[PDB]
Write a protein that binds this ligand. Structure first.
Ligand SMILES: *CCC(=O)N1CC(NC(=O)c2c(Cl)nc(CNc3n[nH]c4cc(Cl)c(C(C)(C)C)cc34)n2C)C1
Ligand SMILES: Nc1nc2c(ncn2[C@@H]2O[C@H](COP(=O)(O)OP(=O)(O)O)[C@@H](O)[C@H]2O)c(=O)[nH]1
Ligand SMILES: [Mg+2]
Length: 169
């Protein structure tokens, strides 16, 4: 029976969580996807020759950290930490999201990938060397993406599936 991986896309408002997920699922760039809508999506993929089913949660909509919600997020097997390269606050919010995840999972090894989205933009305020360095300190992979041009979208998600597989090993 084909393996199921539950992936959670996290990051500040407007970083591109919805546009990344819609590119992976529908291969189309949405620029007006309702910001409050928190939906999940299923996609059958072949990664390194093994077929699997991804269940992908695109987080949305401001809410306080509750206990019920903690238990819902505990079911995530892997987390995409998304910042935008032209949003210093989005980059700064990464540590906060990683700790919340370390907390609910009650564990130091959680499968995670750092994603710097909007790499198509010319106005970059977060240097590639800064994000590499952070990812090295977490010991997680770092991918630069553009949901707009589709550069790196599949690779960010499939890098996370590979982190989950190694974890399960
Ligand atoms: C347009 C607005 C938008 O896209 N965003 C993203 C940001 N929202 C959040 O950061 C957010 C959401 Cl969504 N829910 C919550 C708090 N709820 C919650 N309770 N327990 C947990 C546990 C975890 Cl691990 C999370 C993660 C997965 C880290 C988001 C969330 C909760 N927050 C802060 C506004
Ligand atoms: N230029 C560029 N714009 C993007 C990219 N990704 C998303 N956007 C735009 O940024 C805004 C927020 O995207 P969205 O996916 O809704 O962000 P979310 O709140 O994290 O879901 C929208 O206008 C998108 O069209 C990208 O990779 N490059
Ligand atoms: Mg969204």
């Amino acid at each position: 029976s084909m393996t199921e991986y539950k992936l959670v896309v996290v990051g500040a408002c407007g970083v591109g969580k919805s546009a990344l997920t819609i590119q992976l699922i529908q291969n189309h760039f949405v620029d007006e996807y309702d910001p409050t809508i928190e939906d999940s999506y299923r996609k059958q993929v072949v990664i390194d020759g093994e077929t699997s089913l991804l269940d992908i949660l695109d987080t949305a909509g401001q809410e306080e950290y509750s206990a019920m919600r903690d238990q819902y997020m505990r079911t995530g097997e892997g987390f995409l930490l998304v910042f935008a390269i032209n949003n210093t606050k989005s980059f700064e919010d990464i540590h906060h999201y990683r700790e919340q995840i370390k907390r609910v999972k009650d564990s130091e090894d959680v499968p995670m990938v750092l994603v710097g989205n909007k790499s198509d933009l010319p106005s970059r305020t977060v240097d590639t060397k800064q994000a590499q360095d952070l990812a090295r300190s977490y010991g997680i992979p770092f991918i630069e993406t553009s949901a707009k041009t589709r550069q790196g979208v599949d690779d960010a998600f499939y890098t996370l599936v590979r982190e989950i597989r190694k974890h399960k090993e």
